Amino acid sequence: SFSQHARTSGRVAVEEVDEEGKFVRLRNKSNEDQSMGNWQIKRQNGDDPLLTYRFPPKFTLKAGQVVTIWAAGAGATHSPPTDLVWKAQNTWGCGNSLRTALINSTGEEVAMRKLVRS
Amino acid sequence: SQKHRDFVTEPMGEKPVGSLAGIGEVLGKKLEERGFDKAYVVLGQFLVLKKDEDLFREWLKDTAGANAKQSRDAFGALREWADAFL
Amino acid sequence: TTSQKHRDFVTEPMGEKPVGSLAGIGEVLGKKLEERGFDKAYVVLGQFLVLKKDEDLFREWLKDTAGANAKQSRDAFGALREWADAFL
Ligand SMILES: [Cl-]
Ligand SMILES: [Cl-]
Numbered sequence: 001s002f003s004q005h006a007r008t009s010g011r012v013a014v015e016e017v018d019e020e021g022k023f024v025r026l027r028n029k030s031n032e033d034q035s036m037g038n039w040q041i042k043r044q045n046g047d048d049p050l051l052t053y054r055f056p057p058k059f060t061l062k063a064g065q066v067v068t069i070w071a072a073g074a075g076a077t078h079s080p081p082t083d084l085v086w087k088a089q090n091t092w093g094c095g096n097s098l099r100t101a102l103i104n105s106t107g108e109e110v111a112m113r114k115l116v117r118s
Numbered sequence: 119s120q121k122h123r124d125f126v127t128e129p130m131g132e133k134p135v136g137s138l139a140g141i142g143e144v145l146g147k148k149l150e151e152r153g154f155d156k157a158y159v160v161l162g163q164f165l166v167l168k169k170d171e172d173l174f175r176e177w178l179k180d181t182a183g184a185n186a187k188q189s190r191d192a193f194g195a196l197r198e199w200a201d202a203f204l
Numbered sequence: 205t206t207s208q209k210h211r212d213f214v215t216e217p218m219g220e221k222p223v224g225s226l227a228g229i230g231e232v233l234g235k236k237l238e239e240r241g242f243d244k245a246y247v248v249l250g251q252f253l254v255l256k257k258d259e260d261l262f263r264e265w266l267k268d269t270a271g272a273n274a275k276q277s278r279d280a281f282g283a284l285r286e287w288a289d290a291f292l
Pocket of ligand 2: 226228279
């Protein structure tokens, strides 16, 4: 259904993007902890307005750990550091092109996963 | 092709020119002789030509003797890769 | 001393950005690059990549094609080397 295109320039990867828009999953693929306070996930679905999730001001993703950022409508609970809920947003969005990018607190794109419909 | 999927799904980095779809052994060595040894060098040529299909495929046919299928597959892999990572 | 143009360029994919978005590419240098088919930043990335990321060849190409000075060529090269190391 969708072809996957991913890039990781630092410690944390955009490991999985739910095709149905329930969540985005990140993994610290390094042997060091990553501070991600005020980091963002930019989500561009086709030409629809950009959605941007903002991590809490203090958040550490430990070495080797996963964090799933759930949309509020997926029926998930806010249980850190493994699961965060995007309070404002009930879906990550649908479309033919779904681009999820991890950004540091200063606007640097450090990782992405893009799903393009076949 | 299996090569096309392996190429368009991730950054190309220092991959050899042979990792690009359409680039067989003969076409790859003739590209390597002309200074197109890594896949990023052919991406570079594709980008200098403003991603134009006719100019890129004609360049691949004239520079290293690619056939129509090889040129189409290399152009398609580079176009898809650039649309995701550039 | 990295310019605000350098910082905005190396931190994200260049996409369809104009050649002027690249560090070192001022208004005169940009117009001269546009006039010779180097209209978008990705076209200059392309030239940088055809030259195998070589500093001396890229910088002398930029001077011979669009009249860049040493500073402009150094800043353009530095922005493309950093961008390629993160996104390529
Ligand atoms: Cl054809
Ligand atoms: Cl500058």
